[PDB]
Write a protein that binds this ligand. Sequence first.
Ligand SMILES: Oc1cc2ccccc2cc1O
Length: 222
Amino acid sequence: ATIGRISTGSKSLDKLLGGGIETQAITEVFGEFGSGKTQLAHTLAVMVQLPPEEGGLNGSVMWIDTENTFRPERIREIAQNRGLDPDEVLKHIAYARAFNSNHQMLLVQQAEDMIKELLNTDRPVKLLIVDSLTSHFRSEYIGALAERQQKLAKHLADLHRLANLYDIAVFVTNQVQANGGHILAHSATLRVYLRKGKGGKRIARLIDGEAVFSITEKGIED
Ligand SMILES: Oc1cc2ccccc2cc1O
């Protein structure tokens, strides 16, 4: 398949990304608590449902939530301010809460079944969100870094396999602050560092210029 791109909602961030986040790729956004990673996830879950002329892929979404941070009412707001019907947008987001890191890993295998079911339809899965990818692994494997890295490596390999095999954009969030961070090392296809700037602006930079955007009723925008 050709590489599809999903607009983030911000022209600035899209330019930094070469058009948007890519299918057949894992995009990892990392930054401190409150930097806007989950807002970007919510915005992408709407944008992907637009037609390509508007920066989407007419796609369905699957969302694995590890921190109870998915907000359907926020999806509704972004959808209504992106000219989409909010009910239709929510009907095309499959949502699961991961109870722990092992359940999170099983959910990726379960996601493959729905991906296959929708593959030949007019609304194939085009976006798989894992928010937060690392939170359960970090809490469960305190003092056991080597084992944590083994499990994360398999989890990321599973996500890679889905991105490439089914032409999906995988978007994962990772909280990194004071003294923290192996990030995801070199595993993601693309690492985006997100941070707060003056006056509530958000700033993004590729790791391995800078885009600037705001959180608004449209999700994010310039
Ligand atoms: O109904 C489902 C929703 C999911 C969401 C995320 C990952 C896997 C899922 C599997 C489902 O059957």
